[PDB]
Amino acid sequence: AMGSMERASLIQKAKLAEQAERYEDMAAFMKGAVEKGEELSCEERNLLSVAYKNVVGGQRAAWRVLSSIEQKSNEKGPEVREYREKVETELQGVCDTVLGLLDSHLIKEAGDAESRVFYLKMKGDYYRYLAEVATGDDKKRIIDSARSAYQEAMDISKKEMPPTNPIRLGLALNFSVFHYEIANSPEEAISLAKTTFDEAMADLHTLSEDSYKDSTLIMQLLRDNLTLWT
């Protein structure tokens, strides 16, 4: 639907939509920008991620509210299940849209470590969101798709980025959450968070004041999870 709008205008409108807290619009503008077929800059990748994370974050929060109501009712009519299913189908549609952009063709064109890790982290995240609602015969395959994307991103990040790099840290944070919440592997989650935190700490001395702030912010999230989990 964005085919007639200039790439630069889509990016500009995505930034306006962010300021206006219109995240559905923001995601639609960024989808249009991706579909222009050019690679995305660092700033543009961040806009894409912010837009879809906010859209799917609202859907996930709503799904959790409805799932809790549904579980209490099963301890009435079909309405709670029907509405939870409606929200779930919408959420799955957004995840499928993001995964489709990554597969056509953001990942295959991403050769630099920063871009490839970013997109593989996204792929892991959106399969993780699908896994949160999955219950059928493809749930194990959904979980393995998330794991495989995160693992490839981890392998690249360890070879190509310093331990304080914000995308490397955020990837490790999210893969640890995957281990804890999705894969039923709390020890792996804790080990990954601890090792990531400690290796970043030992590399902070190389950073400028601004980079130090970026890295320590994400390290604090790792610490918050370790405090919750231990």
Partner: peptide, 7 residues
């Protein structure tokens, strides 16, 4: 629920 990456 633990924290995944957030702004």
């Amino acid at each position: 629920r633990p924290s995944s990456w957030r702004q």
